[PDB]
Amino acid sequence: KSDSENIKDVKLQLNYAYEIIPVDYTNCNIDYLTTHDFYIDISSYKKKNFSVDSEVESYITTKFTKNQKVNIFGLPYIFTRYDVYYIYGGVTPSVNSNSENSKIVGNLLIDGVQQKTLINPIKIDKPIFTIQEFDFKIRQYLMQTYKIYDPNSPYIKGQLEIAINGNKHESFNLYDATSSSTRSDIFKKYKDNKTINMKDFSHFDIYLWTK
Amino acid sequence: KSDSENIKDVKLQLNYAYEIIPVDYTNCNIDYLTTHDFYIDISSYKKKNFSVDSEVESYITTKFTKNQKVNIFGLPYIFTRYDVYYIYGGVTPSVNSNKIVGNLLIDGVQQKTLINPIKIDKPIFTIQEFDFKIRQYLMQTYKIYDPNSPYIKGQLEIAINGNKHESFNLYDATSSSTRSDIFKKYKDNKTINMKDFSHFDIYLWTK
């Protein structure tokens, strides 16, 4: 009865996955490090014992050390009866007051043609941030503004490209899911804990396609 | 070639709606009050200008006053580009101060007796907070809103000392219900004093 039914279901899974409140805490202590998990304390914020378990890919926790202060910006993929938030990656070194006021500019292209230059569509206050934080915020902006995950929008393909000084153009599929994808499935990509220093950030490009 | 689509679609809307981190803040200043909205400041928490707009039914904000301190526990129903959380109800007075037990029955057979599946530390709390925590307990433990679970009907009954108990439908959604549709019930800002809370009873059915 249709040839676009699948992309609609894919968009539905993405719209649901990203319509969420992130785990956002700054200047938190790394209580313990395992081969693939960060165990971070956020008890001071909660006023009761509470931690965050950030699961990552190999050789990421080795970049950190116990009792180092870090910032957390991760999307929860599951909830349990315990006072612990479960996220993938989203961990960066906290190196200052975390009150950066840097300008974020980007280009929005649809079907290969520039539509507008986005000025501060999103805001990031930390000097070092994860692509997860940038990705979440930009998708939310796109969801709210261009309805990119609405079944009635013409967008069925899209990429987010982040330009970093040194020809490093990170590129991510904006329609990265199947009709069966859970938040865990969709967020697993963030286990690489990919991080960018705002000072190395040049701009970003959003490529949306209708065919 | 789809079977039992309805109940599954209803469960899906609910599963989507309740799988969220709530707007939870304590000792917040009421910056402004309109006929149906509370505009509460949470900037000190967000380390940036940020507010919460709690929409409620008539004559609820009239029970509060500008600059009174309140606690917030509400479920966001929409996200926008602005630094404002949008919820229904979830507002209680912050008190100088600042024992949940019940049973669980499935298809008439009591499975859990006198359990404390959730925790609320406020001496006064909204039924919204209680309801959210109970549903998360049920979603986590029994996957009550997963289309592949057998639970298709349910009631959450709350007993209050010296008062009539109240019962709430746990599958209160249609196949086209948004988060706003499902959370609209919380606009009554129904609240309970912990000291008056007696116990609860959860009933689930597969038939």
HEC string for chain B: CCCCHHHHHHHHHHHHHHCCCCEEEEEEEEEEECCCEEEEECHHHHCCCCEEEEECCCCCHHHCCCCCEEEEEECCCECCCCCEEEEECCEEECCCCCCCCEEEEECCEEEEEEECCCCCCCCEEEHHHHHHHHHHHHHHHHCCCCCCCCCCEEEEEEEECCCCCEEEECCCCCCCCCHHHHHHHHHHCCEEEHHHEEEEEEEEECC
Are A132 and A172 a contacting pair, CB within 8 Å?
no
CA dist list (Å): A128 to A15, A21, A29, A205: 27, 21, 17, 20
Q: Nearest-CA neighbor of B179 among B40, B66, B15, B36?
A: B15
Chain A residues whose CB is inside 8 A of the B81 CB are 141, 144-145
Pairwise CA distance, residues B141 & B183, whole Å: 22
Are A153 and A143 a contacting pair, CB within 8 Å?
no
Chain A residues whose CB is inside 8 A of the B117 CB are 81
**CA trace torsion B183, B136, A185, A61 (10° rounding):** 120
Distance from CA of B162 to the nearest CA of A (A): 31
Pairwise CA distance, residues B151 & B202, whole Å: 12
> Could you say which of B21, B76, B141 has the minimum Cβ distance to residue A76?
B21
Residue range(s) of every CATH 2.40.50.110 domain in chain A:
21-95
Q: Tell me whether residue B199 is annotated as binding.
A: yes
Residues of A with CB under 8 A from a CB of B: 16, 19-23, 26, 76, 79-81, 99, 125, 140-141, 144-145, 183
Pairwise CA distance, residues A135 & A170, whole Å: 11
Experimental method: X-ray
Test the B interface: residue of A81, A82, A125, A186 with most B CBs within 10 Å: A81
Q: Nearest-CA neighbor of A130 among A52, A70, A178?
A: A70
B60-71 in b/e burial notation, b at 16+ Cβ within 10 A?
A: bbeebeeeeebb
Q: A104: which 2 tokens?
A: 């974020």
Contact A81 B21 (CB under 8 A): no
Residues 6+ away with beta carbon under 8 Å from B196: B160, B161, B162, B163
| Architecture category of domain A1-20+96-211 in CATH | Roll (3.10)
CA dist list (Å): B160 to B74, B93, B197: 22, 19, 5
> What is the number of CB-based contacts under 8 A between chain A and chain B?
32
Test the B interface: residue of A1, A13, A21 with most B CBs within 10 Å: A21
Chain A residues whose CB is inside 8 A of the B21 CB are 20-23, 76
Pairwise CA distance, residues A207 & B15, whole Å: 32
Measured in whole angstroms, the distance separating CA B161 from the mean position of its chain's CA atoms is: 21
Pairwise CA distance, residues B99 & A125, whole Å: 41
Distance from CA of B57 to the nearest CA of A (A): 25
Q: Nearest-CA neighbor of A102 among A206, A171, A202, A28?
A: A202
Contact A20 B16 (CB under 8 A): no
Pairwise CA distance, residues B165 & B150, whole Å: 27
Are A184 and A77 a contacting pair, CB within 8 Å?
yes
Region for B35 from its dihedrals, namely left if φ exceeds 0, alpha if ψ lies in -120 to 50, beta otherwise: alpha
Pairwise CA distance, residues A33 & A30, whole Å: 7
Resolution (A): 1.8
Residue range(s) of every CATH 3.10.20.120 domain in chain B:
1-20+96-207
Per CATH, the number for B1-20+96-207 is: 3.10.20.120
Q: Tell me whether residue B131 is annotated as binding.
A: no
Give the strand pairing for A201-209 and A157-164. antiparallel
Are B203 and B157 a contacting pair, CB within 8 Å?
yes
| Architecture category of domain B21-95 in CATH | Beta Barrel (2.40)
Residues 6+ away with beta carbon under 8 Å from A93: A64, A68, A69, A70, A71, A128
Residues 6+ away with beta carbon under 8 Å from B201: B102, B103, B104, B105, B156, B157, B159
Q: A13: which 2 tokens?
A: 């899974």
Identity at B33, one-letter amino acid code: L
Chain B residues whose CB is inside 8 A of the A183 CB are 19
Measured in whole angstroms, the distance separating CA A121 from the mean position of its chain's CA atoms is: 15
Q: Nearest-CA neighbor of A9 among A196, A188, A200, A175?
A: A175
Contact B20 A21 (CB under 8 A): yes
